[model samples]
Target: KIFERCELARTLKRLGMDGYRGISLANWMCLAKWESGYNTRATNYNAGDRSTDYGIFQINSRYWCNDGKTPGAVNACHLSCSALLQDNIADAVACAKRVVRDPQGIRAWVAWRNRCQNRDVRQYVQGCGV
Candidate 1:
């Protein structure tokens, strides 16, 4: 499912992402925008480690979900990689929440740092009324 921008904002707000762990909803929207463009099935496979990033926030098999493939992978989120690809983003949202609890916080997502950090970011949730 590819969500419209405002639709996604409202949805994430409902999912408790608005201020999860001090990371604002706009930052999360920014992450999803750059990482998957709001597409639930988006994926990116890392050639360096053979680990695949799955779903909206691009959660990786290397440290979060299990694909039963990535070497030394840890299923910290206790979910299958396939769960992250589902149109229902509940599991994906949960995993993203867990990831942000780490020391890196939202910086766990490199794309968020590169694209959203220190930016106006209001563009993500401005007219959404979320």
Candidate 2:
């Protein structure tokens, strides 16, 4: 399953990888667990699993893949683009590393703080950023 290194990098890039120096494996795994259970074809009925509350990233196909009013991105032949119908956590991680390979130090630490935004799972997720 980890055979597509380059593809993964590309996906992480889309997530604001900036320079493949801000993202870390811990951050990737953390986001993946919260996003898709690491399932490339994962889907959510409530829509919170994705950013647009639609496809994998749940990017709302109508906005990114279908319509053009929302500054949507193009659909590539990446692993989960079709089979998953949403942005896979796998892809997002790769793009993240490319963009922010060193996000673990402060950003991820802060993210750990933000995950406690609503006090939901605050105790369990707090300070979990690696």
Candidate 3:
């Protein structure tokens, strides 16, 4: 699912994700941008570990969602991994909230740790008019 910057901002706000579950909107937006470039169909299959990262948050099938083919998946979100690859983002938001609640917090996302951490992300939503 492709989304304009402002469109995503509006949706995030409407979902109360602008500050939901102790995560900032800027961090979420920035993290999503780096993770999947805002493309819902994005999937990264790690051949070495035989695990897949799915959707905008790149929620891992190893623990979050069942990809159906991955054995022993924890399926913490209790949904199919494919469910996240859609324009409707409510499920993604729900799972992400759970992820952030982890002891690692936003550090659960490697992209956030590497790129968004300590960075000025005000520009991510600067002109969204949200």
Candidate 4:
């Protein structure tokens, strides 16, 4: 949890969140909390063969994992694979920050808040006190 919090703060700060009165940091933290409950070792076996999800953000291994991209992965960490399996904290946080930045489109964490609420996961954005 401590590591997760630290990475959350570091990642948000590096992504220009320090500007714009720092609302971005608050937003990012809200996203993280709602995503994985700040559990760095959190993993979800919602699927069979333990190939469902993992990490502080519950990022699915099948989605985030890649060939040799997962740190210290020997053959395979599990089924989905993890970029931080080898203790790569910075890499994991950078990926999260990238998702918030969303280079693929004009997406931001703020835009995804509404869609995060579901029957399976009831977490929501914080007070959003900007």
Give the runs in model 4 whose Cα sits over 4 Å from its true position. 1-11, 14-23, 48-51, 67-80, 85-88, 101-130
How much does each candidate deviate from the true structure in C-alpha RMSD?
0.7, 9.4, 1.1, 7.8
Tens digit of per-residue lDDT, candidate 2, span 20-103? 354343344344445544445554442333223222223333222322232434433233234334344544344333223343
Question: Candidate 3 overall Cα lDDT vs. reference?
Answer: 0.86
What lDDT would each prediction earn against the true structure?
A: 0.95, 0.37, 0.86, 0.47
Considering summed lDDT, which 10 consecutive residues are worst modelled in model 1? 121-130
Across 11-82, the per-residue lDDT of candidate 4 in tens digits comes to: 546655533332345544555575566656666665343344556555554445543343343322223245
- Summed backbone clashes in each candidate are 0, 27, 0, 0
Q: Candidate 1: what lDDT?
A: 0.95
- Among all windows of 10 consecutive residues in model 4, the one with the lowest summed lDDT is 117-126
Q: What are the models' TM-scores? A: 0.98, 0.35, 0.94, 0.49
Please give the distance, in angstroms, between residue 14's alpha carbon in candidate 1 and its true position after superposition. 0.4
Candidate 3 root-mean-square deviation in Å: 1.1
As for candidate 3, its clashing pairs are none
Highest TM-score: which candidate? 1
The better candidate by lDDT, 1 or 3, is: 1
Where does candidate 4 clash, by residue pair?
none
lDDT of 1 at 22: 94
